[PDB]
Amino acid sequence: VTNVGEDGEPGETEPRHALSPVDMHVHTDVSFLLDRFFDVETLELSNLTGSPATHVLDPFGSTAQLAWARLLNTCTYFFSDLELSIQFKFTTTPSSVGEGFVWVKWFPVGAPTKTTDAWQLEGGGNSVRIQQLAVAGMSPTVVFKIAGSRSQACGFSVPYTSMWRVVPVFYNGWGAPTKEKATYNWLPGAHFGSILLTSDAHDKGGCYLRYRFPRANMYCPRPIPPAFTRPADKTRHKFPTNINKQ
């Protein structure tokens, strides 16, 4: 009612010569917010021998206060490719590992799994056994050394493997006929596939997972979790910054 200002008048609000543009919104571009490296996870290695476990690239669980945590929670359905950096930190005296040969293998959404030592390198007694799937072949293997290695890390790009045209970050259903608990918001292969780190370290070190999700596609906006306690009435939420009264 009445609209454009100055007259005390009922529905009549005042004028607003709305703003110009700068930045063209671009930072809030879902594809851009997601194409960078995130420190998601931290895990330890496996000994070259034993009958070890594969690890799963599932950045959909969350709960850890991390920005990329939420954001993936912001949408119902997601699709993007993957990109890694694995860094391996030291947890003892760095002079313990002279070699430090690390085997890594990537497993695509839905690959077979049981592995036991099965490859045997020998030479001058002693002789090493690497893992049955640590080996090089079909799924990409990546071997790197950490011995003065100016950056104890390795890295690469890996495609959207799932058999699902998109991934439901939420699922009002079960992924199995047996409607068991655990099988709730599940639906199998709703992730990026898996990896196996294995080495004569394993002890002496932890890892550093890092994902970069290029080509981000987000479908169906969802409620965006608060992330901070509710401040008191009629007040602000004061925080420490690059600004502030010095």
Binding site: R165, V167, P168, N172, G173, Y184, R222, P223, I224
Partner: protein, 200 residues
């Protein structure tokens, strides 16, 4: 007024079945009408009636019901219309929404029920395809949702993509009685796969 859930419904036949496809004439997927519940004077805000479609209440669609019984999968939308009944002396409002893979449900999955959302949610419920039911303005919320989900069609026995929230915003303030909520679901663009055998 008519509000669309993300997009008008497509009668396209499933990108993932070489298997023979029965399309459902309205006259099969007919129309269904039930009472959700009686919004009462006590139920503080944040409450809600979860209506995950269609299950729990699927036993009651007695025709549409029937074909989805003896058939493995289905793809279909939903014309749905929530109808609260109250006089002009009542106050209060709800917000009813269609939610994609809604979940919390304390695994009472696919069973309609009642809950109290966490708040950040009712605050942001509106971020989904929803409509406002304001007791001094209207008495009907009307929505239409399309098939949706990771698969190009699913098993309604394991998954319900669409689920109506009927959220309590401003408490029911006014005459002592309750205000009965109600809802008419009627399947849109229904399509089945693989007939299952005989119940023996």
């Amino acid at each position: 007024g008519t509000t669309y859930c993300y997009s008008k419904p497509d009668g396209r036949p499933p990108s993932t079945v070489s298997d023979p496809v029965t399309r459902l004439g309205p006259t099969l997927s007919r129309h269904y009408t039930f009472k959700v519940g009686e919004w009462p004077h006590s139920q503080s805000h944040g409450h809600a009636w979860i209506c995950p479609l269609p299950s729990d209440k699927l036993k009651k669609m007695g025709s549409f019901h029937e074909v989805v019984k003896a058939h493995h999968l289905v793809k279909n939308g939903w014309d749905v219309v929530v109808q609260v009944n109250a006089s002009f002396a009542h106050s209060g409002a709800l917000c009813v929404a269609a939610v994609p893979e809604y979940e919390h449900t304390h695994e009472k999955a696919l069973k309609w029920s009642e809950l109290e959302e966490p708040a950040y949610t009712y605050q942001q419920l509106s971020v989904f395809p929803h409509q406002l039911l304001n007791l001094r303005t209207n008495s009907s919320v009307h929505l239409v949702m399309p098939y949706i989900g990771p698969g190009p069609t699913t098993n309604l026995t394991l998954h319900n993509p669409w689920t109506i929230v009927i959220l309590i915003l401003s408490e029911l303030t006014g005459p002592g009685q309750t205000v009965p909520v109600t809802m008419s679901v009627a399947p849109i663009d229904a399509m089945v796969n693989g007939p299952l055998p005989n119940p023996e």
